[PDB]
Design a protein around this ligand. Sequence first.
Ligand SMILES: *[C@@H]1O[C@H](CO)[C@@H](O[C@@H]2O[C@H](CO)[C@@H](O)[C@H](O)[C@H]2NC(C)=O)[C@H](O)[C@H]1NC(C)=O
Ligand SMILES: *[C@@H]1O[C@H](CO)[C@@H](O[C@@H]2O[C@H](CO)[C@@H](O)[C@H](O)[C@H]2NC(C)=O)[C@H](O)[C@H]1NC(C)=O
Ligand SMILES: *[C@@H]1O[C@H](CO)[C@@H](O[C@@H]2O[C@H](CO)[C@@H](O)[C@H](O)[C@H]2NC(C)=O)[C@H](O)[C@H]1NC(C)=O
Ligand SMILES: *[C@@H]1O[C@H](CO)[C@@H](O[C@@H]2O[C@H](CO)[C@@H](O)[C@H](O)[C@H]2NC(C)=O)[C@H](O)[C@H]1NC(C)=O
Ligand SMILES: *[C@@H]1O[C@H](CO)[C@@H](O[C@@H]2O[C@H](CO)[C@@H](O)[C@H](O)[C@H]2NC(C)=O)[C@H](O)[C@H]1NC(C)=O
Ligand SMILES: *[C@@H]1O[C@H](CO)[C@@H](O[C@@H]2O[C@H](CO)[C@@H](O)[C@H](O)[C@H]2NC(C)=O)[C@H](O)[C@H]1NC(C)=O
Ligand SMILES: *[C@@H]1O[C@H](CO)[C@@H](O)[C@H](O)[C@H]1NC(C)=O
Ligand SMILES: *[C@@H]1O[C@H](CO)[C@@H](O)[C@H](O)[C@H]1NC(C)=O
Ligand SMILES: *[C@@H]1O[C@H](CO)[C@@H](O)[C@H](O)[C@H]1NC(C)=O
Lengths: 37, 230, 316, 79
Amino acid sequence: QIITTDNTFVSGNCDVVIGIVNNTVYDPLQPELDSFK
Amino acid sequence: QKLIANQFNSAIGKIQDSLSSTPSALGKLQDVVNQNAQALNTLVKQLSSNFGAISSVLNDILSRLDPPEAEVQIDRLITGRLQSLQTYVTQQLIRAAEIRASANLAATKMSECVLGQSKRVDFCGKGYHLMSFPQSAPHGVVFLHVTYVPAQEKNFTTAPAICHDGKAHFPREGVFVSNGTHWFVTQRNFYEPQIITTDNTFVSGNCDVVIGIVNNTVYDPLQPELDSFK
Amino acid sequence: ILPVSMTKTSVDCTMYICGDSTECSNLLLQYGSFCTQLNRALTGIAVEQDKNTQEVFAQVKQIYKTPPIKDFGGFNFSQILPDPSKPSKRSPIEDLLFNKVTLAQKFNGLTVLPPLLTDEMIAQYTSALLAGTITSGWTFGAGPALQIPFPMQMAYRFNGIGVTQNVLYENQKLIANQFNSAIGKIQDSLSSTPSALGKLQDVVNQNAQALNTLVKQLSSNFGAISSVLNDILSRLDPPEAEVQIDRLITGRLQSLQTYVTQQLIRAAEIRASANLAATKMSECVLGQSKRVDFCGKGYHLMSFPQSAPHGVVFLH
Amino acid sequence: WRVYSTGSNVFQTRAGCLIGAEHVNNSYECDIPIGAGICASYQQSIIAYTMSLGAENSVAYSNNSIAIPTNFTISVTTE
Ligand SMILES: *[C@@H]1O[C@H](CO)[C@@H](O[C@@H]2O[C@H](CO)[C@@H](O)[C@H](O)[C@H]2NC(C)=O)[C@H](O)[C@H]1NC(C)=O
Ligand SMILES: *[C@@H]1O[C@H](CO)[C@@H](O[C@@H]2O[C@H](CO)[C@@H](O)[C@H](O)[C@H]2NC(C)=O)[C@H](O)[C@H]1NC(C)=O
Ligand SMILES: *[C@@H]1O[C@H](CO)[C@@H](O[C@@H]2O[C@H](CO)[C@@H](O)[C@H](O)[C@H]2NC(C)=O)[C@H](O)[C@H]1NC(C)=O
Ligand SMILES: *[C@@H]1O[C@H](CO)[C@@H](O[C@@H]2O[C@H](CO)[C@@H](O)[C@H](O)[C@H]2NC(C)=O)[C@H](O)[C@H]1NC(C)=O
Ligand SMILES: *[C@@H]1O[C@H](CO)[C@@H](O[C@@H]2O[C@H](CO)[C@@H](O)[C@H](O)[C@H]2NC(C)=O)[C@H](O)[C@H]1NC(C)=O
Ligand SMILES: *[C@@H]1O[C@H](CO)[C@@H](O[C@@H]2O[C@H](CO)[C@@H](O)[C@H](O)[C@H]2NC(C)=O)[C@H](O)[C@H]1NC(C)=O
Ligand SMILES: *[C@@H]1O[C@H](CO)[C@@H](O)[C@H](O)[C@H]1NC(C)=O
Ligand SMILES: *[C@@H]1O[C@H](CO)[C@@H](O)[C@H](O)[C@H]1NC(C)=O
Ligand SMILES: *[C@@H]1O[C@H](CO)[C@@H](O)[C@H](O)[C@H]1NC(C)=O
């Protein structure tokens, strides 16, 4: 399934963790709020 | 991760010194060997006893008396030796039952601790249980329980619920704690404070139901995002 | 209710069989090392009983004390905490248990050894375990004791059986009242029927019966002239007195051997029961168990151990 | 054999008499089992005392006080 901000929890800075990979996390808020600018 | 690896490495290396520190560490196997060895030695020693007969040696029994009269002495010796052998066999059977119980316990410990996590307390060494490692032994099995025990604890003032506009708030996963000025939500087994509203709180009832409740601001990060559209 | 340890005992082979008569005693040594094996087995049984008691009850490296003021006044724990008014430190339920168990005497060759852990220290251990499970919750068995309010611990325990924290806090008064009523009712249920504690009276009475059977066998002559060696020594000539005393020796030795074997079987059964009780303690009071029906009917929340005259009782 | 029969150092217990072992009213751990909650250990001489159960740890408790760890330690326990 797609990586969304409602599926994963975020805590900490990127530097401390070893082995991370850069990627983009989808946000279900952005397209629902974009239709009601 | 580096600290956990360092602790695990420094912990395993201490097992060798702990085991080799004293000869009493391996008592549970030395006792098992020694009881059987001494029982066998006692059974062997029981052979050279008169048991009320004229002599304990078969050859002397045959040589000293004629068969019609030596038959009684042979019967006495045979009955005594049979009693000794029977009592040794009974002792060995009881000890075998005890060892079978211990082996079943060891098999259960292997199948639970080694091959997966176990939520049974104290069944996996003191403290919370992580992966475990077995080791072979001469007449048994020796385990290594990698446990997780908390330390360096500090106390905070808590409360079961947080008031917010006449609406009780409860922790989704954790416990409300406060350092005296502000309130946070943290996992129950490790101090890690966070903001409250975003995901880790669920709403039920009003404030008048619960007994001891405290007021605090419940701030959803959703609203600042909405104000970005104003 | 689970038995944990039978009464320790030990017999002197020469004193029991030979009556300390000289020549009859030196005649026994011809039979071999039968005397040493029985003494060693009885010593092993006694040390196993001691180990069972220590393993079941000494589950904590520290002793805890309940707070002087009961700030968890929702739930009422006066029926299981150590009552200070009585001269004994046993709790009211413990005191009811002690008075409900009744019948082990000295004899010619039989003795009884006191346990290492006296009853008062066993009660102290149980009080420490109860105070740990009341104040610090389930985490005092894993590491350092962590204080936590009792309603919050109950909220966690409810959260561990598939029901969220809403149920407890919104119904704290009802839960406290029901818990107090049940804790009051268990005492009446236990005191109502004397046969409730039968699992300990059984082992005590049956050990006493075995000991009496062992003692009663003296009177049996085993086909000899008389049951007293004095009559044989002072009446019959040595040539046949030797045969008669040897027959009596064989009979008494066989009786003692069968008693020793029966005690070994009983000790094995009691060791199994004590291991089960220790596992039950370590999985019930020192934490939460997901094992259904292993900790009583219904989903398990807590467990309060209490001492017994020769075992441990659990209040799931 | 009877040289260890001096009555000046005889200590009476609940599980028989003791000869040559000093008796102290303090509290220590279980070193050598004796019986009826008495254990003997080594100080110069041998001391026999009454058994003790760890060290008292009165945990502070309140209806609004909780404690959570801020650090961990990993331990390996043999069996
Ligand atoms: C993931 O993205 C971040 C940010 O774009 C990268 O961090 C920077 O990487 C460049 C090299 O590509 C460095 O010159 C910068 O100094 C980095 N920024 C900081 C603050 O250190 C990061 O390298 C990317 N991850 C990977 C694996 O390339
Ligand atoms: C309790 O925790 C709060 C967390 O916010 C502390 O407040 C912070 O204190 C630091 C100290 O330098 C400031 O830099 C932050 O700006 C403060 N944050 C806020 C939101 O005010 C507070 O000091 C702590 N109090 C105690 C007694 O530990
Ligand atoms: C924890 O217990 C203390 C001790 O009783 C409570 O403090 C009292 O609370 C009552 C009810 O609000 C007041 O009338 C008293 O004046 C308080 N006394 C003191 C000395 O503070 C406290 O309220 C309890 N807290 C909870 C959450 O139950
Ligand atoms: C938490 O907030 C509630 C309301 O948001 C407070 O209840 C108020 O208490 C005062 C007492 O002086 C009353 O005059 C108000 O009418 C109450 N408001 C409501 C909506 O009932 C409550 O006292 C606050 N508690 C704390 C500890 O600050
Ligand atoms: C907790 O339970 C104890 C029971 O031991 C209660 O004490 C009894 O209270 C009743 C109330 O009338 C008295 O008649 C009894 O004499 C008390 N003692 C006993 C041994 O029953 C106690 O009231 C309960 N509540 C609290 C807060 O302790
Ligand atoms: C948590 O505890 C560990 C040790 O159990 C701490 O690591 C120690 O840190 C000090 C100073 O940073 C070093 O001198 C020690 O050598 C470290 N111990 C080990 C075993 O490596 C760690 O700092 C603690 N965490 C916090 C946040 O204080
Ligand atoms: C994995 O191991 C390789 C070694 O071949 C190393 O080059 C790489 O950086 C490692 N990556 C991570 C995430 O550990
Ligand atoms: C935390 O516990 C200690 C005792 O271990 C106590 O002295 C202290 O007051 C407690 N903290 C607070 C905030 O009360
Ligand atoms: C130790 O205490 C006992 C009473 O508990 C007392 O009789 C004895 O004199 C004390 N010993 C010393 C050396 O004071």
